[PDB]
Each structure stands twice: as structure tokens, then as C-alpha cells.
């Protein structure tokens, strides 16, 4: 034979593909879980990158293999479709190939192995859908305060369990807004979280409204107003120019003083249109001239200059108003009365250390809140700041995808027992393909046990004994829906603990992991040119 490249086949090619996929898994293996260790990434320049995120590693990891590039593209599909569980998919996809390669040495044809994973993954989705749970604990029952209490027990903030967690529950319930077709989700950035050192750590207080950090400028403005009108303007009341990069040079000295009267006179027309609305609270993002602040005292309006663009967007949603981009109508300057104005009840300024917040309370439709944390020391209150935001997303994500499932390895353990008894009811060379699919799911509770500094053999054994007794008889005396506790290293019920995962996360993770184990296994030959 005379050819321009190398050609090889046999069990070695499948063995090389399994060993290549096993090398990628072992890299992200010990990084699975919140306790996973950090790992360095060295480039050709010699720079180093450190992080524990498995999704970040796979994106920055570079290894050239034909099969290894399949798993790297696989994580991109899981990330763009969902964005969580990319580490678990790579680990499971490797354990499928390890057990499948052993069956090949048993003279089991790959087609019978592929047909097993398609039937096992199909029966797995049916069994999970029965064990699911819908959105609950929103009325009549509270086990939802223990939802964030578990995530807050790993921080110093967990000293008072029911005091700090009760405000997280009221924060996620107050932000509910449909916005589409009876959808409603829980938007990410709503509640403003700050810190204070005052007098004790027990003074943390929940507030309903928006927390705006600004100043009232001169003292001529009142710090409290009952006015419902909320003026939202993006146009700058300061001196107007053609552009920042294009400057007009004035050669005539008399034209210099003639122009100086123009911007001063135009603001006199601009101040009359604003005061004609009768709105006290005034928000100007582009800044307010010093001479314009004097007319604010005559009418008694409360105005703010240099307002942050991100702040006004949340105020417009809190006050239920529309943001005015500019006064240009393409014809003449107009403030658009009765339109851009908002609705509120009481607006009062609150006293905080070194910073003074402007609090707008009880608007028409807001679906927001604010929580000020009064602590003891800066080191103590800083950790409590990110601790609430972390536990808030945990309670949020559960109450958003509405159907969740108990996590912590409870899904893989229950599927291992049910699918193993289902393998004996089929036959026709489908038993070994389905049976090895049940053992491959045990890597998820195995990996989490090793990263938790505990014995993996004992925890998985005690975990399988509980889910089996649930399949034997429905009676309550047998444990049901038992997960794994990473902190104490023992079995724990995840339903009461409040550790959940969305349904689409576990379902799509098993489908993509099955398709990857099939795609790599279908390659019987390697041809080079």
C-alpha cells in the first residue's frame, strides 16, 4: 500500500479516545463543588491564572486531540443553553467511556452499547419528572427561611439564623414583577446593599424602596418632600457645546461676550419649563449649573446633579416613569409635561455615616427594596454584604425556574438503583449497557465526597441504602430524598435544608453527556493525510 498519510484502527483507537477524554475530566474533577481547589493556568508568556471554576478552565484550556475538542465544544452548548453544570457533564461523559471501553473487551458491539444509553437516558428523564417538585413555600408554609440559612451557615453572618435570613425572604418576594405574559422571574440587580459600623451588628434593617446615594447640594433645598411628581431628565442643564472633540474657535472678541449671554439666556427658558411642571424631586444626569441651583430654592424643589445613569434606570422602574433623553422635539425645547413625571408618596433623606442616602418610599409600582447593614467592624460587615447576595441568588434561582430537584448527589443515587432494576426487565444484550450507565452516575456523589475531605466509600454506601428503602415500600419510616452534606460529611435531607437545582439543569446534563459518549464511541478509524 502507498498512501500520503497514516491509517490505524482497532481497539487502540477507541482506547486512545477514552484515555484522551479521561485526561480532560481528571483536570476539572477535583474542582467540582464549592470546596473545589484552585488550579493554575500558565500561558506561553509565563503569566498565571488561578480560579476554581470548571467552566472557566475548559474555555482557557488548550489540549490538541480529535476527541478532546468534542468535549470542549460540548461545554459551550451547555453554557449557552443553560450556563450551569458544564463540569458535571464532562465528568459523566468520561465515566461513560471508561465503562463502555471495558464492555468492548467483553466482545460487546458498540451499537448495543449505544442503544443502551439511549434507553437509559430516556427512562431517567421519566423517573426524574415524577420525583420533581414545583414552586412552593410562597404562602402558608415557611421552610423557605431555612433555604438561605444553609448557605449562610458557612459564613460568620450565620451567628443569628432567623434574624438575617428573614430579610432575604422578604426581599425576594417584594421584587416579583411579571413584565411578560404571566411569566414572572426575579431580576438580578434590584435591592441595594450597603454597610454601616454603628453601635452593633444587630441593627441591620430592611427598607422598602430605592436607596440613592447623592447630595442635595446647597442647603437651600429641603431634605424631605411629599410631592408625588418625579422628574427624570437625561439632559444637562450646564453649558451646551457642539461636541467635546469639536471646539468652535471664536475670532471676534465681541462675539465672545455675545455668546456668553446665549447659554445663560437659554437656561432661563429651560428653567421655566421645568418649574412649570411643579415637580420637586428632580434628577439630572448631565449636571446642573450653579446659577440654576438658585431657582431651585425659590420654588423649593429638591434637585440632584451628576446622577448616575444606572441609578436613574432603577428609579424609573421604581417610580414607574419614563426617562427623558433630551428636550429636543426636533422643533423646540419641551419637558413633555404629564408624561415623563412619576408617582410617589414620601421622599425623605436618611442619615448614614459619611454618606447620605436619598430614600424614595412607597411609589406606585416598584418591585424593589433596600437593606442597610449596620455592623461592628469593616471586616465583619464586608463579609456579610456578599453573604446576603450569595444566599439571595440561591433562594432566587429556586423560585425562578419553577420546577427544581433536590441536589447534592440525590439525583444520581436514585437513578442508579431504579435503572439497575430496569435493566433486568429488557434483555437482548441491553443489560450491560444499562447497568454500566447506573454505575457511571455514582461519580458525582463520589467526587463531592473526596473534595469534602471525607471517605467516599462510606458516604456513597450510606446514600444508596436510603434511596433503596424508598423503592421497596412507600411507607414513611424509610428515608426519602436524602442528599449529601459537604460541611459535616454525612447524609442530610436536602428538601428541608433548601439546597435545590433547576430541573432543566439535570435533564439537559444527562442528554448532552449521552450524546458525547456516543459521538466519541462511533469512531472506529483514524485516517491521516
Amino acid at each position: 500500500l502507498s498512501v500520503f498519510g497514516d491509517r490505524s484502527t482497532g481497539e487502540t483507537i477507541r482506547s486512545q479516545n477514552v484515555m484522551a477524554a479521561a485526561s480532560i475530566a481528571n483536570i476539572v474533577k477535583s474542582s467540582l463543588g464549592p470546596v473545589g481547589l484552585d488550579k493554575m493556568l500558565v500561558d506561553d508568556i509565563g503569566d498565571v491564572t488561578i480560579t476554581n471554576d470548571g467552566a472557566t478552565i475548559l474555555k482557557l484550556l488548550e489540549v490538541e486531540h480529535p476527541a478532546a475538542k468534542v468535549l470542549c465544544e460540548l461545554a459551550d452548548l451547555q453554557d449557552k443553553e443553560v450556563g450551569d453544570g458544564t463540569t458535571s457533564v464532562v465528568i459523566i461523559a468520561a465515566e461513560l467511556l471508561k465503562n463502555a471501553d471495558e464492555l468492548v473487551k467483553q466482545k460487546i458491539h458498540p451499537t448495543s452499547v449505544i442503544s443502551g444509553y439511549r434507553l437509559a437516558c430516556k427512562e431517567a428523564v421519566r423517573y426524574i419528572n415524577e420525583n420533581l417538585i414545583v414552586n412552593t413555600d410562597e404562602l402558608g408554609r415557611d421552610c423557605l427561611i431555612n433555604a438561605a440559612k444553609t448557605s449562610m451557615s458557612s459564613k460568620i453572618i450565620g451567628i443569628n439564623g432567623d434574624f438575617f435570613a428573614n430579610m432575604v425572604v422578604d426581599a425576594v418576594l417584594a421584587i416579583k414583577y411579571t413584565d411578560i405574559r404571566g411569566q414572572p422571574r426575579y431580576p438580578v440587580n434590584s435591592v441595594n446593599i450597603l454597610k454601616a459600623h454603628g453601635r452593633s451588628q444587630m441593627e441591620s434593617m430592611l427598607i422598602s424602596g430605592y436607596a440613592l446615594n447623592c447630595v442635595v447640594g446647597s442647603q437651600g433645598m429641603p431634605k424631605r418632600i411629599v410631592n408625588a411628581k418625579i422628574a427624570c431628565l437625561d439632559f444637562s442643564l450646564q453649558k451646551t457645546k457642539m461636541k467635546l472633540g469639536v471646539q468652535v474657535v471664536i475670532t471676534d472678541p465681541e462675539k465672545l461676550d455675545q455668546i456668553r449671554q446665549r447659554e445663560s439666556d437659554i437656561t432661563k427658558e429651560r428653567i421655566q419649563k421645568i418649574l412649570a411642571t411643579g415637580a420637586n424631586v428632580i434628577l439630572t444626569t448631565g449636571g446642573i449649573d450653579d446659577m440654576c441651583l438658585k431657582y431651585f430654592v425659590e420654588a423649593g424643589a429638591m434637585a440632584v446633579r451628576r446622577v448616575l445613569k444606572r441609578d436613574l434606570k432603577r428609579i424609573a422602574k421604581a417610580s414607574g416613569a419614563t426617562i427623558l433623553s433630551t428636550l429636543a422635539n426636533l422643533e423646540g425645547e419641551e419637558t413633555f409635561e404629564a408624561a415623563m413625571l412619576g408617582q410617589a408618596e414620601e421622599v425623605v433623606q436618611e442619615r448614614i455615616c459619611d454618606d447620605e442616602l436619598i430614600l424614595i418610599k412607597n411609589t406606585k409600582a416598584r418591585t424593589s427594596a433596600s437593606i442597610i447593614l449596620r455592623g461592628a467592624n469593616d471586616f465583619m460587615c464586608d463579609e456579610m454584604e456578599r453573604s446576603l447576595h450569595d444566599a439571595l441568588c440561591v433562594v432566587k434561582r429556586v423560585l425562578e425556574s419553577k420546577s427544581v430537584v433536590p441536589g447534592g448527589g440525590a439525583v444520581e443515587a436514585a437513578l442508579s438503583i431504579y435503572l439497575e432494576n430496569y435493566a433486568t426487565s429488557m434483555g437482548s444484550r441491553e443489560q450491560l449497557a444499562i447497568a454500566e450507565f447506573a454505575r457511571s452516575l455514582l461519580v458525582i456523589p463520589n467526587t463531592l465526597a473526596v473534595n469534602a475531605a471525607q471517605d467516599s466509600t462510606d458516604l456513597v454506601a450510606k446514600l444508596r441504602a436510603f434511596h433503596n428503602e424508598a423503592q421497596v415500600n412507600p411507607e414513611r419510616k424509610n428515608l426519602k430524598w436524602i442528599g449529601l452534606d459537604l460541611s459535616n460529611g454525612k447524609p442530610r435531607d436536602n428538601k428541608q435544608a433548601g439546597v435545590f437545582e433547576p430541573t432543566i439543569v439535570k435533564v439537559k446534563s444527562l442528554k448532552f453527556a449521552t450524546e458525547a459518549a456516543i459521538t466519541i464511541l462511533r469512531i472506529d478509524d483514524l485516517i491521516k493525510l
Binding site: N26, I27, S30, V35, L37, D38, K39, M40, L41, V42, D43, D44, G46, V48, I50, I57, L60, L61, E62, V63, G245, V246, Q247, V249, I250, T251, P253, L256, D354, A453
Partner: protein, 512 residues
């Protein structure tokens, strides 16, 4: 390709301990010199730990992160760079629990974090307050870095230069006592004079030299103008380059450049200021219109410099020279002095008050002296900066290390669990600091260290340290080795976080 498992945590120990073994003898006044061979045959005998590791090229990733942390520690605090590396290398030097005992890394990490909290609480009990109103009490503290230096003669005046400069930058109104030396305390070398002629100036100093004889020599109430735009031929919005070749292109541009600069310089001379400080450069045609008003021309200055110049005289920064207003003045400034000092022209915008800044002038007969006196007063301010933050000292010479080591040992008796074994190893890891002090003196290490432990058990741990010069045991109340507390707090906090960072890495994999 890639390395994972226990080999990485075993390899990181040998990489961190090797770097630590170099500077072990570089600690203390008895510090041994080190010889570095250049590829061309050069030899540098300097004993400075920062300079040695700066020229060493290490190929191990953890060895690079170990050095870069020491460089960051040097910028914040001008002392303790050697102590951080020795302690961080000693805490990682125990491989018994990592390999033989097969303890999980997170279990050992939990032992360091529980110990770090007790190490900080112990230093606050043995500390002592400080009286900052006494100039002589602050003098005895700064003499630690002054010894064996060229400034020791004028050190009495050199102390007042560093002590007063830090008090100026210190802001006690906000409560945080924020001090930035590289900003307001910024210093420049002045050729000429002697060390005694170095004084403290309140204001900002401009090192630009007088090009032409027409300028304001002395003014009672100067007028300073700050503006962003430059003075030159107007450039378009494109990248088109201006290259002057044909005479036809000369007169056309020269006439346009003359009319464009004359109009911008017109509004400048209308206000009649005493100086013009522009951020960007100033061309030759623009300097001609400035000399007609008999003023000083200043060019090539940055934004942060202008912000300190604006706060000095109370001026205002204007975008373009066409938009200049009467609101921009140097009213309130002390005076303007173009007088030459040391064969160089200086520009003094300074004043008799403290506009939240200062300037330090260094006088010397040669550049060799100016280079030595400069770095001697830079770390001198670093010492005074850390004391004024938290006026509390700690005993030095190995007394504070043996003090915490005794508190952790008695605390470990109530610890019930597997973490008690690595928790006690931290107490014995702090003993390397008094060990290197005795080893350099040539005395017996075992005999003195054993007798030192029995003193802290009975007598107060605040005293009975190790004498660096003599080599025997002496109390710290009779000697001036008392160190600041803010230096030690960040010394142990950084050393523990450095050890934990290297233990959390179980795998090293390339990529891009």
C-alpha cells in the same frame, strides 16, 4: 505538560523553601552579605533582600508568585520584606501532615485560619501605647533604620523632615488618617548645597527651567491658570501627519498657526495672570505671545500634578483657553520665585499655608549623596507613616514571635480534634525569627533558644527578647528595638495567606 496530585503541593514546598533559604542570613544587623555573579563578570555584595531577589530569574510559577507578593509588601510598608518570606517559607516547610499523615489540604488550611485570628488577638494584648506629641519619643523609634547610614550626622534634622511631612499629609478630620507619600509628600533631588540645607516646603514645586529672561521674578499674589488644551497648529480629527517640505505649504500653515495661537493666547493675556501652566506642550510661536505679557511659561504637566496645583492656589481647570474665565486665579498663593538654586531654575507656586500637600527639597554636593539621602528619607517616612496610623508598638528582636508562640501552645490544650497537630506547628514556625538572630551572632542556637522559652512561660512575654549586637538575652524595655504594630499585623497576615494560596493549588496545567 501537566502536573497534578500531591506532587504539586510537594513541589511548591521545595520551590518556596529554596527561595526562603537564601535570605535566612539576611535578617538582622549582623546580616551576611551575598555575592551575585553577572554573566559579564560583575559582582554585587549587597545584603538587601529586595535587591537580591529582584535580579534572580526563577522558572517556577509558585516561585514567581512568592516574589511578587514581597514586592507588593515593599510598596505598602518599607520594612519586613525579609520577615514575610522567611515566615511564609517556614510554615510551608512542614511536609509531615501533607504527605506522611495524608491530611487533606482544606483540613490544614482550617488550622491556619483559626490560628491567624489568635495570632492577631495576642499581639494586641502585649502591645504598648505611643505618645506622638513628644518629638524625642518619636526620635528613638526612627533611629532603628537611621543606624549605619550616611544621614546619621544630620539625622536629628532628617527626623524632623520625615516626621513633619507625614503629619501634613495625615488627615485627622475624616477619621481614617489617610496618608499618601507618593502624592503629597513627593520629593525631588536638588543639586547643590549640603544635607543641612534640606528643608520642608509647603506647596508644589516645578522643576522646569527658565528659557528666556522675561518672567515674573517675585509676586505678592500670584495668578495661576490651568487648562487642558495645548497651543500649536490646530490638528484635524484624522491621523493625517504634518510634514513641512515645500515653501508653499510653509506660509499657508504658518499663517494659520499664527492666527489660531494668537486668538487662544489673546484670552489668556486679557485676564493678565502671573503664570500659565498648560497640561500639554507649548510650541515656539505660542511662547512668543506669552513673553509679551512678561509671564512664566510652564508646559508638559500631568493631570494629577495639576490637581495638586489647583488645590494649592485655589484655581480652576478650564477645558479650552477660549473658555477661560475670571474665576481662575492663583489668589491666595504665597509668592512666585524663579530664583536659581544649584545652577538650575526653579518655579515656586508655594505658600505659607498647608493646602493638603507639601514638597521636600534635598540639597547635596553631589548626585551620589542625593541618591543615598533620598532613599534614606523614603523609608524613614514609611516608618513614621505606620506609627501615626496605630500609635502602638510591639517588642522586637524575637520577643513578639516567642510571645505568640506561647499563647498558641496553651490554647492548643483545649483544642479537641485532628486539627490540633498542625495548629501547634504554627507556634514552632514563628521560632525561625529569633533563630536567625542568634545564628548570625555565632552563639549556640539550642542553648539560648531553650532558655528563651522558659522566660516567656514565667516572666512577661512583652520582654526578654534576643539582643542582635551582643547575642545574649535582654529585656526590650531597656532597648529601642520596639517595632510598630501596623507592620507586624500585615507581616503575619500576608505570610499566612501566602502559605494558604500555594496549598490550594493541586494542579498546574498550561494553556492559552
Amino acid at each position: 505538560k501537566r502536573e497534578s496530585g500531591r506532587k504539586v503541593q510537594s513541589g511548591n514546598i521545595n520551590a518556596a523553601k529554596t527561595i526562603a533559604d537564601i535570605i535566612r542570613t539576611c535578617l538582622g544587623p549582623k546580616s551576611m552579605m551575598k555575592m551575585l555573579l553577572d554573566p559579564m563578570g560583575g559582582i554585587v555584595m549587597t545584603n538587601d533582600g529586595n535587591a537580591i531577589l529582584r535580579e534572580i530569574q526563577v522558572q517556577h510559577p509558585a516561585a514567581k508568585s512568592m516574589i511578587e507578593i514581597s514586592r507588593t509588601q515593599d510598596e505598602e510598608v518599607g520594612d519586613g520584606t525579609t520577615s514575610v518570606i522567611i515566615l511564609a517559607g517556614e510554615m510551608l516547610s512542614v511536609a509531615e501532615h501533607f504527605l506522611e499523615q495524608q491530611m487533606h489540604p482544606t483540613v490544614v488550611i482550617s488550622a491556619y485560619r483559626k490560628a491567624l485570628d489568635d495570632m492577631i488577638s495576642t499581639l494586641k494584648k502585649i502591645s504598648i501605647p505611643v505618645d506622638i506629641s513628644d518629638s524625642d519619643m518619636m526620635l528613638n523609634i526612627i533611629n532603628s533604620s537611621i543606624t549605619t547610614k550616611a544621614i546619621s550626622r544630620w539625622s536629628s534634622l532628617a527626623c524632623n523632615i520625615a516626621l513633619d511631612a507625614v503629619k501634613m499629609v495625615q488627615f485627622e478630620e475624616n477619621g481614617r488618617k489617610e496618608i499618601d507619600i507618593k502624592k503629597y509628600a513627593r520629593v525631588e533631588k536638588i543639586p547643590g548645597g549640603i544635607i543641612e540645607d534640606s528643608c520642608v516646603l509647603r506647596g508644589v514645586m516645578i522643576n522646569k527651567d527658565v528659557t528666556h529672561p522675561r518672567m515674573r521674578r517675585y509676586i505678592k499674589n500670584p495668578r495661576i491658570v490651568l487648562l487642558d488644551s495645548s497651543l500649536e497648529y490646530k490638528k484635524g480629527e484624522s491621523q493625517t501627519d504634518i510634514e513641512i517640505t515645500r515653501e508653499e505649504d510653509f506660509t499657508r500653515i504658518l499663517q494659520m498657526e499664527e492666527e489660531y495661537i494668537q486668538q487662544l493666547c489673546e484670552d489668556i493675556i486679557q485676564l493678565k495672570p502671573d503664570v500659565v501652566i498648560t497640561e500639554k506642550g507649548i510650541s515656539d510661536l505660542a511662547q512668543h505671545y506669552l513673553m509679551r505679557a512678561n509671564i512664566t511659561a510652564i508646559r508638559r504637566v500631568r493631570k494629577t500634578d495639576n490637581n495638586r496645583i489647583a488645590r494649592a492656589c485655589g484655581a480652576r481647570i478650564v477645558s479650552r483657553p477660549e473658555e477661560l474665565r475670571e474665576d481662575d486665579v492663583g489668589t491666595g498663593a504665597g509668592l512666585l520665585e524663579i530664583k536659581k538654586i544649584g545652577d538650575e531654575y526653579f518655579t515656586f507656586i508655594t505658600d505659607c499655608k498647608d493646602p493638603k500637600a507639601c514638597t521636600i527639597l534635598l540639597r547635596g554636593a553631589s548626585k551620589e549623596i542625593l541618591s543615598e539621602v533620598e532613599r534614606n528619607l523614603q523609608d524613614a517616612m514609611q516608618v513614621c507613616r505606620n506609627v501615626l496610623l496605630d500609635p502602638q508598638l510591639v517588642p522586637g528582636g524575637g520577643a513578639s514571635e516567642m510571645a505568640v508562640a506561647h499563647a498558641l501552645t496553651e490554647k492548643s490544650k483545649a483544642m479537641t480534634g485532628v486539627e490540633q497537630w498542625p495548629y501547634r506547628a504554627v507556634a514552632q514556625a514563628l521560632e525561625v525569627i529569633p533563630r536567625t538572630l542568634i545564628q548570625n551572632c555565632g552563639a549556640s542556637t539550642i542553648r539560648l533558644l531553650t532558655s528563651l522559652r522558659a522566660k516567656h512561660t514565667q516572666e512577661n512575654c512583652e520582654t526578654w527578647g534576643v539582643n542582635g549586637e551582643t547575642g545574649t538575652l535582654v529585656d526590650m524595655k531597656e532597648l529601642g528595638i520596639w517595632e510598630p504594630l501596623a507592620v507586624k499585623l500585615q507581616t503575619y497576615k500576608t505570610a499566612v495567606e501566602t502559605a494558604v494560596l500555594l496549598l490550594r493549588i493541586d494542579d498546574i496545567v498550561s494553556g492559552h
